[PDB]
Design a protein around this ligand. Sequence first.
Ligand SMILES: [Ca+2]
Lengths: 6, 95
Amino acid sequence: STNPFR
Amino acid sequence: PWAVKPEDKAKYDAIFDSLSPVNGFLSGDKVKPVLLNSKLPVDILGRVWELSDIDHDGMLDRDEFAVAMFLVYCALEKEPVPMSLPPALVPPSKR
Ligand SMILES: [Ca+2]
């Protein structure tokens, strides 16, 4: 997982 | 050339070093708030970070945090952001 925005 | 200039990346290095850089990297925990402050939705920061994440390590280095600063400031007064890391945004460290 990644991108702590979505 | 690099979509970002030295003056545009110079301010990015201040916001990048204002969250406490680690070996030249910022965790989304420091950038997320930096992008959530642009009044933009997580769709711009969820996509501006990705195109900003040049190494995909879950952090924005001084060069990655730069690509995410003009990508966030342009979504407020210029235009939205695409999801395709353009080759004109890659720093020289990726040469
Ligand atoms: Ca990264």
